[PDB]
Amino acid sequence: GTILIDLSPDDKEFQSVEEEMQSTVREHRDGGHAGGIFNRYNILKIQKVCNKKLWERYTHRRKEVSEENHNHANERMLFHGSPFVNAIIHKGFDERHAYIGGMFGAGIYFAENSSKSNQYVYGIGGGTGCPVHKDRSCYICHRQLLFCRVTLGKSFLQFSA
Amino acid sequence: MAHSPPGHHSVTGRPSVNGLALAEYVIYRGEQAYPEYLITYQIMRPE
Numbered sequence: 001g002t003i004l005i006d007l008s009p010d011d012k013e014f015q016s017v018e019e020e021m022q023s024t025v026r027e028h029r030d031g032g033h034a035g036g037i038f039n040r041y042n043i044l045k046i047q048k049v050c051n052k053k054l055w056e057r058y059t060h061r062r063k064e065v066s067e068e069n070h071n072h073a074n075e076r077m078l079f080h081g082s083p084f085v086n087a088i089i090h091k092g093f094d095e096r097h098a099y100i101g102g103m104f105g106a107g108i109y110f111a112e113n114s115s116k117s118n119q120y121v122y123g124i125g126g127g128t129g130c131p132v133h134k135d136r137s138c139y140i141c142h143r144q145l146l147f148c149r150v151t152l153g154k155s156f157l158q159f160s161a
Numbered sequence: 162m163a164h165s166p167p168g169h170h171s172v173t174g175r176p177s178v179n180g181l182a183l184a185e186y187v188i189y190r191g192e193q194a195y196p197e198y199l200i201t202y203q204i205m206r207p208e
């Protein structure tokens with residue numbers, strides 16, 4: 001059901017997604033251990049993910065949340081990095097994509113900082129790094145992140161380190 | 162998967178130590194996210 005449409009680097013949509021990626025890089029407290037050492041990315045491709053069944057599933061749930069929260073979905077665009085990115089784009093997010101040991105319990109995690117999601121592309125803690133070189137700081141191998149539409153509704157605010 | 166806290170649809174993790182960190186968020190239903198863009202990239206070695 002999923003088709004991927006390549007965006008041109010000339011398209012304003014490509015450019016606005018690239019800018020969110022690059023401008024939300026930060027330094028991490030692990031000194032680069034999980035995600036590598038970098039201040040910016042080389043963007044190679046941006047594709048739009050189109051799947052009508054998955055979209056209608058999302059909009060159905062969004063309307064439910066919206067009606068439970070004074071007609072406010074509280075929708076955000078957020079990053080997600082995962083070894084399961086191929087499953088997610090074809091079958092949607094589900095319980096198999098949860099961070100069982102995350103600090104806010106077993107759910108599906110998203111970040112405003114692209115560099116935070118980058119830490120999970122090869123697994124929790126960066127896993128063993130890229131499959132080819134076993135390097136969490138590989139500058140050669142191609143990585144993939146999702147930029148996702150997320151319905152927060154009424155969100156429980158946890159102050160935390 | 163766990164449940165969201167009663168009366169809520171997600172959790173926001175507000176950073177309270179690292180002044181430069183942005184927020185992180187957790188949802189407990191797969192249907193509350195759509196994977197809209199797939200971005201292919203490399204990290205770049207600082208000069």
Ligand SMILES: N#Cc1ccc(-c2cc(=O)c3ccccc3o2)cc1
Nearest residue numbers: 080081082099109110111117120185
């Ligand atoms: N298995 C597994 C697994 C565990 C975690 C993540 C994930 C992916 C994220 O993009 C993320 C963002 C902020 C904080 C935690 C995050 O964790 C993705 C896949």
Ligand SMILES: [Zn+2]
Nearest residue numbers: 130133138141
């Ligand atoms: Zn590599």
